[PDB]
């Protein structure tokens, strides 16, 4: 008795192993992340979050990819040396285990994920996609 | 205040425009499909659906892609060539415009989507994902 | 103990009785502490005949440990690591692994 | 007519079929339209006894020691646990024999 | 809508075997030799 859940929480590709994809998050108001590997990893992997602004040439296309600054919560013990938002998939994840994450503060209209340099080898086996929650219109 | 929605409706890739991937839904109870068009198409894009069963070699690996059967209901009066569940994204669908789909009756362990014979070149510019719901595992 | 020439470590009910009886009696009543894994590995002891060394003929061995002065615990080092390290081949107890204790 | 009341016969051998299929499902119900059987769910801790080598064969088997441990190895902090199996397995256990020949 | 009904004439018996748990064996004895 499944419901059509394409009319609610529609997912979109973000990183298909070797290509980033800015997805529009304006109409939506909440969004998370699912990390799924197709093989085993070799070393720990890191992924950098970016965001785009509407390029003046057209309001419905992403502009450049500007960096996202991670905002600290309470009870924090460490900060990224630059303050920049980035997630990490730890080593020893078997490719039948999805992994969750979510940025607590949005900025821009298109979110994007890129393989942090020096870790793009495992990136191929990694696939990151995004789901959302709201329509608002 | 975007909740961590990785858990509580995650999702995975199903068809990256190049190849299919059976996405386990046996551990789930409700699910659905989300299409996405990246470029203007040429004609109606038909997609065959399939369901899989666990290989006797390993209960955690897909077997073959058995043909999911189309099921009718109250006003279903347009059955296909004896009934084989398969969908079709129509023409006149611009980019940044996602679609929704579902299968009324689940069968097997996981689902898979393939470009119907003749829609491959059009399928080259589509990306299809699957999103689950609620499950207790 | 020896096996096929190899001298892997092990543990026998004889050694258990030796340890529990070796307490200086004049001290006083000294109870013992151990993991349920150890008591299970013990109650499942089989002789060369094929008989259970304890509770012979009722598929289980269950004496009241209070009478047998044994308090049980479950977050002790548990020498049978994950209840999988009895030892005939590569399952040796890895000599240097706590088994049990006893005190007043 | 036809004195034997078919109505009550069916009213009985509908609930009987329903009950037996309910039990079968809740035991091994395979996902779709079948309540998930705890057998096929396969997240229970499952212990497999190691085989025995009879004149160099490494033949699978099962002796009373494994059973007694599998019953006792249950963490008592969870509470009282009951065991379920076939009567064939029970007769198999009651038919065990030592090397000398005694039951 | 003629419904059929058929029964056999002569029935055949049913035999079977009664395999039973084997000898007690040791999956490793302590005092042994290579």
């Amino acid at each position: 008795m499944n419901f059509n859940v394409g009319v609610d929480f529609p997912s979109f590709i973000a990183w298909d192993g070797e290509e980033s994809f800015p997805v529009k998050v304006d109409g939506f108001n909440q969004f998370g992340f699912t990390f799924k590997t197709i093989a085993a990893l070799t070393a720990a992997t890191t992924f950098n979050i970016f965001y785009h602004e509407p390029s003046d040439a057209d309001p419905c296309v992403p502009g450049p990819a500007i960096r996202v600054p991670e905002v600290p919560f309470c009870d924090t013990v460490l900060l990224s040396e630059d303050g920049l938002a980035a997630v990490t998939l730890p080593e020893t994840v078997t490719p039948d285990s999805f992994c969750a994450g979510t940025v607590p503060c949005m900025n821009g209209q298109w979110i994007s994920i890129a393989p942090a340099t020096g870790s793009e080898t495992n990136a191929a086996n990694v696939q990151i996609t995004v789901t959302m929650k709201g329509a608002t219109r | 205040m975007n909740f961590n929605v990785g858990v509580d409706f995650p999702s995975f890739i199903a068809w990256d425009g190049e190849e299919s991937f059976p996405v386990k839904v046996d551990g789930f109870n409700q699910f659905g499909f989300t299409f996405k068009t990246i470029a203007a198409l040429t004609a109606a894009t038909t997609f065959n659906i399939f369901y899989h069963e666990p290989s006797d070699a390993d209960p955690c690996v897909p077997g073959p892609a058995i043909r999911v059967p189309e099921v009718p209901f109250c006003d279903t009066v347009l059955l296909s060539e004896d009934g084989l569940a398969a969908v079709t994204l129509p023409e006149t669908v611009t980019p940044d415009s996602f679609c929704a789909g579902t299968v009324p009756c689940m069968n097997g362990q996981w689902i898979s989507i393939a470009p119907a014979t003749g829609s491959e070149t059009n399928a080259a510019n589509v990306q299809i994902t699957v999103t689950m719901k609620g499950a207790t595992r | 103990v020896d096996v096929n020439g190899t001298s892997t470590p092990a543990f026998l009910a004889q050694d258990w009785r030796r340890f529990v009886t070796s307490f200086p009696a004049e001290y006083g009543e000294a109870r013992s502490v151990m993991h349920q894994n150890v008591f299970g590995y013990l109650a499942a002891m089989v002789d060369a005949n094929g008989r259970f060394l304890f509770g012979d003929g009722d598929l289980t061995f269950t004496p009241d440990l209070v009478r047998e002065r044994i308090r049980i615990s479950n977050c002790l080092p548990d020498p049978t690591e994950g209840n999988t390290k009895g030892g005939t081949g590569q399952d040796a107890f890895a000599a240097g692994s706590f088994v049990a204790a006893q005190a007043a | 007519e036809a004195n034997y009341d078919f109505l009550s016969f069916m009213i009985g051998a509908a609930q009987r079929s329903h009950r037996i299929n309910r039990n079968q499902a809740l035991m091994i119900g395979k996902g779709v339209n079948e309540p998930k059987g705890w057998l096929t769910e396969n997240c229970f801790p499952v212990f497999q006894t190691l085989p025995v080598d009879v004149n160099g064969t490494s033949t699978p088997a099962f002796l009373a020691q494994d059973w007694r441990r599998f019953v006792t190895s249950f963490p008592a902090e969870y509470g009282e646990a009951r065991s379920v199996m076939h009567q064939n397995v029970f007769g198999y256990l009651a038919a065990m024999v030592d090397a000398n020949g005694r039951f | 809508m003629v419904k059929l009904n058929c029964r056999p004439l002569c029935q055949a018996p049913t035999a079977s075997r009664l395999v039973s748990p084997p000898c007690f064996i040791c999956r490793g004895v302590a005092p042994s030799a290579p």
Partner: peptide, 22 residues
Amino acid sequence: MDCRNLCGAAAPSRLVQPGCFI
């Protein structure tokens, strides 16, 4: 930051028992 699993994969738990050790 919160990670999951799909299959049980708890199949092999080979319990060992004290053989005839004498």
